[PDB]
């Protein structure tokens, strides 16, 4: 039932590698479907462009914490849009942030999921019950560690960390 997707990452125009994710479609089908669709770019957004992670960036990276990206509309953390509209409800919190390499939804409080997500670099139990965990890095965790090095304690990312390609795997 679970499906897989991938991201090809570039740092300042230089390819850093590929990350392959397994989506927990069997636990959070709705949340996973949104992410999958955003990887393929098959849906048309509120504007006239397709909702796609391609060319989007990781705007906030904090070492020993997580990598955040997915702001496909404003690229600074204030935007985002899902295939269900501007936002959608928290599906469930069955999965916890108990290991590094987990995919989780970023939000602005209860039921405000859109397209922003985070990739954990360590367990983040304080996020349990507040963020929906819907995936796992099954390949390329080493690429994620390379991205981590581009971050700062403030979350500021100096170089451009971009998803140059993506889709189902």
């Amino acid at each position: 039932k679970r499906s897989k997707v991938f991201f090809d990452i570039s740092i300042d125009n230089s390819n850093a590698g590929r990350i392959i994710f397994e989506l927990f479609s069997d636990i959070t089908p709705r949340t996973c479907e949104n992410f999958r669709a955003l990887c393929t770019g098959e849906k048309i957004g509120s504007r006239g462009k397709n909702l796609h992670y391609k060319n989007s960036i990781f705007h906030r990276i904090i070492p020993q914490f997580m990598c955040q990206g997915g702001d496909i509309t404003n690229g600074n953390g204030s935007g985002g849009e899902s295939i269900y509209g501007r936002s959608f409800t928290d599906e469930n919190f069955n999965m916890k942030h108990d290991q590094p390499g987990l995919l989780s939804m970023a939000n602005a409080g209860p039921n405000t999921n859109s397209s922003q997500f985070l990739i954990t670099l360590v367990p983040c139990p304080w996020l349990d019950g507040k963020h929906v965990v819907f995936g796992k890095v099954i390949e390329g965790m080493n690429v994620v560690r390379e991205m981590e090095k581009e971050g700062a304690k403030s979350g500021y990312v100096k170089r451009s960390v971009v998803i140059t390609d993506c889709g189902e795997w």
Partner: peptide, 11 residues
């Protein structure tokens, strides 16, 4: 602190 929000980044 260490949160992952979208728009008002807190402590």
């Amino acid at each position: 602190x260490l949160l992952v929000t979208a728009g008002l980044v807190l402590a």
